[PDB]
Structure formats: structure tokens, C-alpha cells
Design an enzyme around this catalytic site. Structure first.
Site, PDB file in Angstrom:
ATOM      1  N   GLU A 259      10.905  -9.640  11.036  1.00  0.00           N
ATOM      2  CA  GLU A 259      11.753  -9.881   9.872  1.00  0.00           C
ATOM      3  C   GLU A 259      11.539  -8.755   8.879  1.00  0.00           C
ATOM      4  OE1 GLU A 259      11.222 -11.978   6.256  1.00  0.00           O
ATOM      5  OE2 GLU A 259      12.181 -13.765   7.113  1.00  0.00           O
ATOM      6  N   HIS A 260      10.298  -8.292   8.787  1.00  0.00           N
ATOM      7  CA  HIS A 260       9.930  -7.212   7.876  1.00  0.00           C
ATOM      8  C   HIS A 260      10.446  -5.839   8.301  1.00  0.00           C
ATOM      9  CE1 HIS A 260       6.653  -8.782   5.033  1.00  0.00           C
ATOM     10  NE2 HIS A 260       7.147  -9.852   5.631  1.00  0.00           N
TER      11      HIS A 260
ATOM     12  N   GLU B 176       1.094 -10.494   1.618  1.00  0.00           N
ATOM     13  CA  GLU B 176       1.891 -11.663   1.285  1.00  0.00           C
ATOM     14  C   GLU B 176       1.125 -12.922   1.671  1.00  0.00           C
ATOM     15  OE1 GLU B 176       5.443 -11.011   3.565  1.00  0.00           O
ATOM     16  OE2 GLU B 176       6.270  -9.713   1.971  1.00  0.00           O
TER      17      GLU B 176
END
Ligand SMILES: CCCCCCCC/C=C\CCCCCCCC(=O)OC[C@H](COP(=O)(O)OCCN)OC(=O)CCCCCCC/C=C\CCCCCCCC
Lengths: 443, 61, 49
Positions: free
Chosen positions: A59-60, A136
């Protein structure tokens, strides 16, 4: 122009499938602006133990550039057309979508296609994002609510794939290989499992022609056309108590296995969760709030907030509630909460369901407050329910629900069931699984 | 499936459970009491007045 | 981080009917509960007697 009618007026959602398997769907509005995206049927549930965290690492990178158009090339092209690109990755559903001028409808699809298919996966960037995700995590770890739901899954679905976090392990993030991210993409981001959805001022036909153009996947063997069926996740009446008397408030979440998207009871479950509702210290309502729990919460300063939930999944799900409280009112709160649950199974009143149904419809409508949300409903409906479900239908289904039905269904899923518990913080007051297990009956 | 049927019909609802216990005792009592006595009397044949009885009970005169 | 937390394995204690992590524990629930409640119900009968 009564509500009923406005419902049967909303344009139908069109769906057309390609030879590769990709399913294109959309709801056309006059909106000058719009939203289009690809809703893949992949998540951390598809990941196994060795690659837990791939779909998130991936996703990153779906935004750091493709083979054709590298980093700046991508961003520049996208930033400069006043478009917003963004996405997410759940346990069993991943999504990537853009918010652009209905005008750019076709260039966007090209862009979407270029992301799900030709992600650069620049091994240089990979090592950077590795440090970002790791960062994160440090942050998300300070989100009690998250920690609490992850844990909830961690024990309710212990031993299965659904008991993993989406973000994955600190080890996997530290070691995943370009190759891993690579295959993840190849194995999951596949046509028959993806759904190109759009909403706004867009021609379904124009939409699908664009789809044909860049979403030109090929399928030779049967294997490719097939959608795998995941192994069933076993629910377990259990509890996980992560205690830290140093945190200000305590989080508590309790739940029972839910049916799954397909099951019609879900409607009834929602109507029920609609009765108990949710609360929070800034709800103007106050002592007069309709939800007894909320009301009780207010009268006794039982919690900084509470909320019911019915998290659905393909074959399973979690039906429960979560509350944040002070160390010394955790018990009274838990007590009252189970109280209302038992009341749901034994004495729901017609007046309650009436209010509940109205409140529900209202939420149902807010689920389609913009091209993006609408889009999200399409992508998900097709993905989950197979087809699209119109408010006119939902509304229909909802109306069928009545006290008796709520009680039967709730009894069915709640009464005398071994719940799953997750507690975090200064949780000494709330206690004993047994004492809580007995709260599951009589009411 | 008795366990399922039993659970589903007797043990689940706190009421049906109670009634089942009442009903239970009742049948259990009879059964137990009878069998117990049976076992006792058997282990003690011909020694009880039950056994001797007939020799003088409306047996003479 | 809370992501590195896993519930341990409870196979040494799990009831044979809920040992397989890929089978809906629900189907065996009515029995697991039916059995235990039976013991209790019986105990009540005895005490009652
Ligand atoms: C003619 C035959 C005689 C008639 C007898 C009258 C009938 C009496 C009716 C009693 C009704 C019982 C109903 C109990 C229901 C309560 C309840 O919620 O369950 C039992 C409840 C626990 O809940 P769960 O079983 O885990 O789950 C509930 C299922 N949903 O209570 C218990 O723990 C039951 C344990 C009972 C045993 C304790 C007493 C044993 C004591 C030992 C010495 C005994 C002998 C001497 C006594 C004489 C006194 C002078």
C-alpha cells in the site's frame, strides 16, 4: 416528493464484466467532479505468517511510482490535475481510488491500472518505506482503540489468519523482500478479484471502454479465472487482558461471532445495534438520550464513550461493543452494557425498533454522501454481496424487522454464548471471564 | 444429538432448566428410592420382618 | 508494539471438538454447553433429592 420515491429514483448502478474477469460498475450522477477506484478482494487475511504485512507494505508503494511513470512523474502528473489519490488495506479488502474531475474520468482509469499492475517497487524506496511503516507502528500503538480491536481479533480469532493485524509484525516489516511484495501483487491483485467502480458525472460506457483499454489482463488457464475460497477462521470464547495501570483510561471490547456479509440477519443485527447505539462525553443529548446504556452512562458517569459494532466478513464476523472508562467504573459500565444486551434478547419493544430502524436508514443514507462514499459502497457491495444493494432494497429489508425478530436474532447470536474479550489499561476493576460469561444469560 | 437437543430445549432457558430439575428429581427420586430399597432388601433376604411376616400374619388362628 | 502480540496455543487444553482452527467452533457449541449444563442440572437434581 416523499422519501420512498426519492429512493426508487436514484439511478441504477451499472455493472459489466470483462473477459479477464474484472468487474466494472458505476452510479452516474450529474456531478462535475467524481471518484473512481479499484476495490481488490485482498487483505491481511490473505497473507500468511511469513508475509503478514505485505498488503500494507505494498500500500505504501502503489503511490511512489510505476514502471512507466516514476515518482515525480506520477505525483506531478496527478497533483497537477487537481486529483486526490489515496487508499487503504483492511483484513480482507484493499482499495485504491482517485477523486478527479468527471472530465478526467478516462485518464484516471489509466492511472489506476498503471498502479495495480506496474508498481515500480523501487528497491531503493522499499528500504525507506520500511522505516516509515516501522514508524507508523510506534504511533498506531498509542491508539488504544486500535490496540484493542487488533487484540480483540487476536483472541476472538486466535490461531487463524483473521487474528493478525493488517500492518503486520515488526519482523516482517524489517525483513520483507522486494520479491515478497512482488508476488503478493501477482498473486492477489488479479482481475476476477478486483472491481473498477466509479461514481459521479461519468458515462458507464465511457468508463468500461477505458477499462477495456488498460485493464487488459489475459486469462489462459482456468486457475486464473478462479477466486480462491479462504480457510475458515475459528471463533473462540476467550479473553486477552493487556494491563497497564499507567494509562489514563481503560478500553474494553466484547463480542460474539457474527454471521458474515451474505446473511440477512445482519440487517436485524444492525437494527439492534441501532437501539443500544453509541455515546460519548460530548453528545449534547445528555440524560435524555434515547439509548438506555447511553442514558445510564450519563447518569452514572460510566464511560467517556461506548459504541456498538457489527464488523462483517466473508464467512464470519464480530458483533460487539467497545467502551472507554475510568479504572473505577469499568465494572458498572460492563454490567450495564451486558444488561442491555440481555434486554435485547429478552425484551426489545416495538417502539425501540421503530426508532432504531429510522436511525439506521439515516446512517444508511449517510453512507452515500458523496462520490467517494458511494463508490466505496459499490466496490464493496460487488466484492462482498456480489451485486449492488439499493437503499430501496435495504430500506425494504429494514422495514421487515420488528421487536420479535430482533429478539430472536439477538438471542440467536448473543444469549448464552462464550464472548471474546479484550481489555487494555488500568483494568483491575473489570474482571473474571466467568463473571462476564454469566452476564450472557437471563435479563 | 441429545446434548444439543437437551441444551437447546432444557438447559438454555433458565426457566426450562429449573423445571427440568424439578421434573428430574421427581423421576430420579422414584427410581433411586426403589432401586436402593431393592438392593438393601436383596442383600438382606429372609431377615426382614417383610420376609418373616407371613408366618404369623393372618397365618394362625 | 501490539502487533507482535499473539495469543498462545491452547491445544493442550482445548476440547477435542474445537481443536481444529479451521472449523466453526459453533457447531460443537450446543454440545459443549449441553454437556456441562447437564452435569450441573444433575447436581441440582441430586441436591434437590
Ligand atoms: C419430589 C422431588 C423433590 C422436589 C424438589 C423441589 C424442586 C427444586 C427446584 C430447584 C430449581 C433449580 C434451578 C436452578 C437454576 C439456576 C441457574 O441459573 O443455574 C444453576 C446455577 C449456576 O449456573 P450454571 O449451571 O453454570 O448455568 C445456568 C444455565 N443457563 O447454580 C449452581 O451453581 C447450582 C449448584 C447446586 C449445588 C450446590 C448445593 C450442594 C450442597 C451440598 C450438600 C447437600 C445436601 C443437604 C441439603 C439439605 C439442606 C438442609
Amino acid at each position: 416528493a416523499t422519501y420512498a420515491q426519492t429512493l426508487q429514483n436514484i439511478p441504477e448502478t451499472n455493472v459489466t464484466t470483462l473477459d479477464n474477469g474484472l468487474r466494472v460498475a458505476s452510479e452516474e450522477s450529474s456531478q462535475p467532479t467524481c471518484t473512481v477506484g479499484v476495490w481488490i478482494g485482498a487483505g491481511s487475511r490473505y497473507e500468511n505468517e511469513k508475509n503478514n504485512g505485505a498488503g500494507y507494505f505494498v500500500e505504501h508503494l502503489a503511490f511512489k511510482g510505476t514502471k512507466k511513470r516514476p515518482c515525480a512523474a506520477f505525483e506531478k502528473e496527478v497533483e497537477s490535475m487537481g486529483a486526490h489519490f489515496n487508499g487503504y488495506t483492511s483484513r480482507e479488502q484493499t482499495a485504491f481510488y482517485i477523486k478527479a474531475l468527471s472530465k478526467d474520468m478516462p485518464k484516471v482509469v489509466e492511472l489506476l491500472a498503471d498502479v495495480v499492475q506496474n508498481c515500480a517497487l523501487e528497491e531503493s524506496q522499499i528500504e525507506k518505506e520500511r522505516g516509515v511503516i516501522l514508524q507508523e507502528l510506534k504511533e498506531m500503538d498509542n491508539d488504544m482503540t486500535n490496540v484493542t480491536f487488533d487484540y480483540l481479533h487476536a483472541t476472538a480469532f486466535q490461531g487463524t489468519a483473521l487474528a493478525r493485524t493488517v500492518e503486520g509484525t515488526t519482523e516482517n516489516i524489517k525483513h520483507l523482500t522486494r520479491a515478497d511484495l512482488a508476488s503478493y501483487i501477482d498473486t492477489h491483485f488479479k482481475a476476477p478479484r478486483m472491481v473498477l467502480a466509479a461514481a459521479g458525472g461519468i458515462s458507464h460506457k465511457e468508463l468500461v471502454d477505458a477499462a477495456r483499454q488498460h485493464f487488459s489482463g489475459v486469462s489462459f488457464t482456468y486457475k486464473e479465472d478462479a477466486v480462491p475460497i479462504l480457510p475458515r477462521c475459528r471463533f473462540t470464547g476467550s479473553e486477552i487482558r493487556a494491563r497497564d495501570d499507567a494509562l489514563p483510561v481503560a478500553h474494553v471490547a466484547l463480542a460474539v461471532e457474527g454471521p458474515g456479509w451474505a446473511d440477512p440477519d445482519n440487517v436485524v443485527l444492525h437494527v439492534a445495534n441501532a437501539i443500544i447505539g453509541r455515546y460519548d462525553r460530548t453528545f449534547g443529548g445528555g440524560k435524555h438520550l434515547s439509548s438506555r446504556l447511553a442514558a445510564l452512562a450519563v447518569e452514572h458517569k460510566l464511560c467517556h464513550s461506548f459504541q456498538t459494532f457489527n464488523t462483517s466478513y466473508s464467512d464470519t464476523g464480530l458483533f460487539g461493543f467497545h467502551f472507554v472508562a475510568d479504572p473505577l467504573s469499568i465494572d458498572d459500565m460492563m454490567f450495564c452494557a451486558q444488561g442491555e444486551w440481555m434486554r435485547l434478547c429478552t425484551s426489545t419493544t416495538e417502539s425501540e425498533v421503530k426508532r432504531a430502524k429510522n436511525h439506521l436508514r439515516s446512517a444508511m443514507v449517510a453512507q452515500l454522501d458523496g462520490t467517494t462514499p458511494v463508490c466505496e459502497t459499490i466496490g464493496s457491495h460487488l466484492l462482498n454481496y456480489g451485486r449492488r444493494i439499493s437503499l430501496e432494497e435495504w430500506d425494504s429489508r429494514i422495514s421487515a424487522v420488528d421487536a420479535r425478530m430482533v429478539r430472536d436474532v439477538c438471542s440467536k447470536y448473543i444469549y448464552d454464548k462464550c464472548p471474546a474479550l479484550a481489555a487494555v489499561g488500568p483494568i483491575e476493576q473489570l474482571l473474571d471471564y466467568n463473571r462476564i460469561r454469566s452476564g450472557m444469560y437471563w435479563i | 444429538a441429545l446434548l444439543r437437543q437437551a441444551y437447546s430445549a432444557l438447559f438454555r432457558r433458565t426457566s426450562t432448566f429449573a423445571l427440568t430439575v424439578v421434573l428430574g428429581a421427581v423421576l430420579f427420586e422414584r427410581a433411586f428410592d426403589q432401586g436402593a430399597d431393592a438392593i438393601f432388601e436383596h442383600l438382606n433376604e429372609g431377615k426382614l420382618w417383610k420376609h418373616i411376616k407371613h408366618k404369623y400374619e393372618a397365618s394362625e388362628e | 508494539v501490539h502487533n507482535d502480540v499473539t495469543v498462545p496455543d491452547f491445544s493442550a487444553y482445548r476440547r477435542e471438538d474445537v481443536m481444529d482452527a479451521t472449523t466453526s467452533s459453533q457447531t460443537s457449541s450446543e454440545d459443549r454447553k449441553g454437556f456441562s449444563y447437564l452435569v450441573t442440572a444433575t447436581a441440582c437434581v441430586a441436591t434437590a433429592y
